[PDB]
């Protein structure tokens, strides 16, 4: 899962989804781009998504992606510069332990914090 | 009848054609590229741009096809009016 991790990290830090094989967790419309409705393909998710916590994780994922996406759409830039904020994130260099737990959510909500701070700064100052 | 023809069929269409062809000429007299409709609908297209914000340390004119397109729209919408049509099912 090298480039799979690349895809997931790239989406969590740029909201860009590039799945020419349609394997990623969620997928866009255009099967104008304003009601950017998103759908869950539950058949590929790592968890049963039945209890509250994995639903929480998935929904934070979706929100973070959408937030960064709208940031890019508004500012007319396809890429988010690294140095826009203080919270710096890394790639999933050891997916093995990340999959186990006790770090998955830590990564998820650190990215969530990044998304919230930049997004709120967007609609509060810009 | 003549007045109606020249003041409710032709002129209104010509005014719309010049309005669309002219909107590209001006500079922002209002920073909201706004559209006023026949039903009172008000819609803002384009991106709500940031207010020149310094976060970290060009407008839409028409090509040739749009020109031919808009002139043809003007003409045909004149001749699709109920006071000219002769030979359709409509």
UniProtKB/Swiss-Prot annotation, chain A:
Subcellular location: Nucleus; Cytoplasm, Cytoskeleton, Microtubule organizing center, Spindle pole body
Signal peptide feature range: none
Function: Involved in microtubule organization by the microtubule organizing center, the spindle pole body (SPB). Probably part of the microtubule attachment site at the SPB.
Description of how the protein assembles with itself and partners: Interacts with TUB4, SPC72 and SPC98.
Other comment: Present with 2230 molecules/cell in log phase SD medium.
Family, similarity comment: Belongs to the TUBGCP family.
Listed name of the protein: Spindle pole body component SPC97
Organism this protein belongs to: Saccharomyces cerevisiae (strain ATCC 204508 / S288c)
From Swiss-Prot, chain B:
Compartment list: Nucleus; Cytoplasm, Cytoskeleton, Microtubule organizing center, Spindle pole body
The organism's place on the tree of life at top rank: Eukaryota
Quaternary structure, from the entry: Interacts with TUB4, SPC72 and SPC97.
Miscellaneous: Present with 56 molecules/cell in log phase SD medium.
Record function comment: Involved in microtubule organization by the microtubule organizing center, the spindle pole body (SPB). Probably part of the microtubule attachment site at the SPB.
Family: Belongs to the TUBGCP family.
Name under which the protein is recorded: Spindle pole body component SPC98
Species, as recorded: Saccharomyces cerevisiae (strain ATCC 204508 / S288c)
Full-protein interval shown: 648 to 747 of 846
């Amino acid at each position: 899962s090298q480039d799979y991790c690349t895809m997931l990290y790239e989406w969590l830090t740029q909201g860009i989804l590039n799945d020419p094989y349609q394997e990623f967790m969620t997928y866009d419309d255009l099967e104008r781009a304003w009601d950017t409705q998103y759908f869950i393909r539950k058949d590929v998710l790592l968890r049963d998504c039945d209890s509250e916590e994995d639903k929480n994780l998935l929904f934070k994922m979706l929100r973070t992606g959408i937030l960064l996406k709208v940031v890019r759409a508004s500012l007319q830039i396809p890429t988010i510069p690294s140095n826009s904020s203080d919270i710096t994130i890394q790639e999933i260099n050891d997916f093995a332990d990340l999959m186990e737990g006790s770090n998955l959510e830590l990564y998820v909500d650190k990215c969530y914090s990044r998304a919230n701070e930049i997004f709120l700064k967007l609609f509060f100052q810009g | 009848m003549e007045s109606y023809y020249l003041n409710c069929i032709i002129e209104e269409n010509f005014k719309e054609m010049t309005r669309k062809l002219q909107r590209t000429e001006n500079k922002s007299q209002n920073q909201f590229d706004l559209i006023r409709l026949n039903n009172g609908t008000i819609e803002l297209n384009g991106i709500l741009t940031p207010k020149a914000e310094v976060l970290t340390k060009i407008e839409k004119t028409l090509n040739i096809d749009e020109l031919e397109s808009v002139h043809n729209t003007f003409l045909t919408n004149i001749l699709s009016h109920k006071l000219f049509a002769t030979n359709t099912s409509e």
